[PDB]
Amino acid sequence: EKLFTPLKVGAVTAPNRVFMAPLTRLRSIEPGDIPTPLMGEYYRQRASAGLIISEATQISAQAKGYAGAPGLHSPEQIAAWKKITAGVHAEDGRIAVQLWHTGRISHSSIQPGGQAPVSASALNANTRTSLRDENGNAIRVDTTTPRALELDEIPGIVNDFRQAVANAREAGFDLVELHSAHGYLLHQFLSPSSNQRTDQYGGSVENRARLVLEVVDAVCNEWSADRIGIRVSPIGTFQNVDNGPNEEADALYLIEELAKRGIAYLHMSETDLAGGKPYSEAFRQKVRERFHGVIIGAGAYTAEKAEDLIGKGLIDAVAFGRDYIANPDLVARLQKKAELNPQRPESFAGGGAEGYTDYPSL
Ligand SMILES: Cc1cc2nc3c(=O)[nH]c(=O)nc-3n(C[C@H](O)[C@H](O)[C@H](O)COP(=O)(O)O)c2cc1C
């Protein structure tokens, strides 16, 4: 077994290869999109993970698409996250913040000024996001048609990612993960399905990847390349965003570009919850020969699949999502071959302590 052996992940050293995937739980305070001590307890419980990757966190107020998702743009958010990272560190853990802009997976009622959310193009996502009702409970609501960003707004978006990384470093995170997956803003630019722009940020794959690579360069310059990871979902369809008619070649272009920056890791979200065609071993080989940082695989993994792919030299670590919701001590359980706690999906999104901090250890 290799899952319980250490791994260098850029600037930090993980003691095992069992990572906690980013998981939106929608329990932040409004007004202010503020993380809470309850969230701190949840993360502290999971500090034995090789690496915790936080729930997706707004780079700006405009970035918000979900009621209850936290930000990392305000002083109060910075202060609250500082307490959370300190608690994880007190338990000898490591924590990355996943930073997003939701783009068109959003609703005008939670945008600044009540305005339409932004995207690469003015095309509805044709999905739902999660808002809160008058009692503060999570509700699913159809997405608002977005406004296409003007060319002169793009530097501001890059600056918002840069600023959020400055804030993340101050807040005590060990790494940052850019959310370039799952149909959110960066992926909206990457995908031809969502990007119909005819300027330097659409058309060719070079142009479609331009924004994400500008963001990568800005955040590497703000902090250091060995502090930066990126999550992609570049094969298949996620939240109605496919990867276009040349998805493999386009993915390999992006990955070769990322490699040039010497970033800490590439995190591949392989499938959504409904599943789909597995990655071919040939594709995994092509990725591996092009990227020289850590590769994290995710999406309905088992420990056995992770060991197989680590043993084949194709990935370095695995991120578990739902098994981490339900098993704070997932590392110990997988090491000991213990049963896993029963998941309670009704409490994944929103609410309070129940279904959040009340899953037991062994
Ligand atoms: C409740 C829930 C929230 C999620 N939130 C995020 C998120 O904030 N960022 C992200 O990149 N993926 C998110 N995902 C995807 C997970 O990180 C993970 O890739 C997915 O659940 C599949 O892995 P699993 O089979 O181990 O759960 C979420 C998944 C679930 C079930």
| Three-state secondary structure string covering the chain | CCCCCCEEECCEEECCCEEECCCCCCCCECCCCECCHHHHHHHHHCCCCCCEEEEEEECCCCCCCCCCCCECCCHHHHHHHHHHHHHHHHCCCCEEEEEECCCCCCCHHHCHHHCCCEECCCCCCCCEEEEECCCCCEEEEECCCCEECCHHHHHHHHHHHHHHHHHHHHCCCCEEEEEECCCCHHHHHHCCCCCCCCCCCCCCHHHHCHHHHHHHHHHHHHCCHHHEEEEECCCCCECCECCCCCHHHHHHHHHHHHHHCCCCEEEEECCCCCCCCCCCHHHHHHHHHHCCCEEEEECCCCHHHHHHHHHCCCCCEEEECHHHHHCCCHHHHHHHCCCCCCCCHHHCCCCCCCCCCCCCCC
Pocket flag, ligand 1, residue 21 (CB < 6 Å) = yes
Residue with tokens 């990935």: 315
d(CA 325, CA 246): 35
Is the four-CA dihedral 57, 60, 65, 67 of positive or negative sign? positive
State if residue 33 touches ligand 1 by the CB under 6 angstroms criterion: no
Residue nearest to atom 14 of ligand 1 (CA): 23
CB 133 within 8 A of CB 139: yes
* Residues written for the chain: 362
The reply to whether CATH 3.40.50.2030 applies to domain 1-362 is: no
Q: Is the dihedral of CA 141, 147, 152, 154 positive or negative?
A: positive
Q: Are 103 and 132 in contact (CB under 8 A)?
A: no
Nearest-5° Cα angle at 260, 241 to 220: 80
- Contact (CB, 8 A) for 215 and 158: yes
Residue 246 CB: number of other CB atoms within 10 A? 12
- Dihedrals phi, psi of 234, to nearest 5 degrees: -90, 0
After which residues are there C–N gaps above 2.5 Å in the chain? none
Q: Which residue has the tokens 């597995």?
A: 278
Query: Any binding-site annotation on 322?
Result: yes
Alpha-carbon span 22 to 125, nearest angstrom: 22
- Indicate left, alpha or beta for 144 from its phi (over 0: left) and psi (-120 to 50: alpha): beta
Distance from the alpha carbon of residue 99 to the mean position of ligand 1, in angstroms: 14
Count of beta carbons in the 10 Å neighbourhood of residue 134 = 6
Sequence-ordered list of residues with C-beta below 8 angstroms from that of 216, at least 6 positions apart, any chain: 178, 228, 230, 258, 261, 263
Residues forming a β-bridge with 34: 29
User: Is 237 labelled a binding residue?
Assistant: no
Residue type, 259: A
Q: Is 179 in the pocket of ligand 1 (CB under 6 A)?
A: yes
- Integer Cα distance of 217 and 203 in angstroms: 21
| Residue in 18, 19, 23 to alter for ligand 1 test, most ligand atoms within 8 A of Cβ | 23
Q: How many CA atoms lie within 13 A of 236 on its CB side?
A: 20
Residue having the nearest C-alpha atom to atom 23 of ligand 1: 299
Q: Is the CB of 59 under 6 A from ligand 1?
A: no
Rg (CA), the chain: 19
Measured CA to CA, the distance from residue 259 to residue 130 in angstroms comes to 35
- How many other β-carbons are positioned within 10 Å of the β-carbon of residue 341? 18
Please name the amino acid found at residue 182: H
Name the token pair of 137.
């409970």
Contacts of 204 by beta carbon, 8 Å cutoff, 6+ apart: none
Q: C-alpha angle 224/319/52, rounded to 5°? A: 55
- Out of 42, 43, 66, 184, pick the active-site residue: 184
Does the Cβ of 270 fall within 6 Å of ligand 1?
no
Tokens standing for residue 249:
């070649």
- For residues 288 and 47, what is the distance between their CA atoms, to the nearest angstrom? 29
What token pair was written down for 28?
């932040």
Distance 231 CA to ligand 1 centre (A): 11
Instruction: Respond yes or no: is residue 356 known to be catalytic.
Output: no
Distance CA 274, CA 30 (A): 31
Strand-pair partners of 178: 99, 230
Residue found by looking up tokens 């493999």 in the block:
248
